[PDB]
Symmetry: C4
Subunit: 30 residues, 4 copies
């Protein structure tokens, strides 16, 4: 079922959760 489309996407969402922790640079470092 066109698993090719879901595979990339799946990683796409995986990056967001990682983003929040990375944002801490901004918050802290004004």
């Amino acid at each position: 079922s066109d698993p090719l489309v879901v595979a990339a996407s799946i990683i796409g969402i995986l990056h967001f959760i990682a983003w929040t922790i990375g944002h801490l640079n901004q918050i802290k470092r004004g």
Copy 2:
């Protein structure tokens, strides 16, 4: 089929805009 293709890309604009605020750190440099 459920819009799998657009569903993933939808988030993409989010990651793009969030990117800019990141660079904001290098400014002060320190």
Copy 3:
């Protein structure tokens, strides 16, 4: 012509070139 599939990846490569700037994150330490 399923422009959705081709147009969405475009951003994908755009992030890689910007990525290298991040190296500056630790370049200044120790």
Copy 4:
């Protein structure tokens, strides 16, 4: 003939590994 869909998923694996590199920046700080 241009597997765009699979083309993205192939790149991401590259991002995931470099991604952790940032974590040095924050952890040390907090």
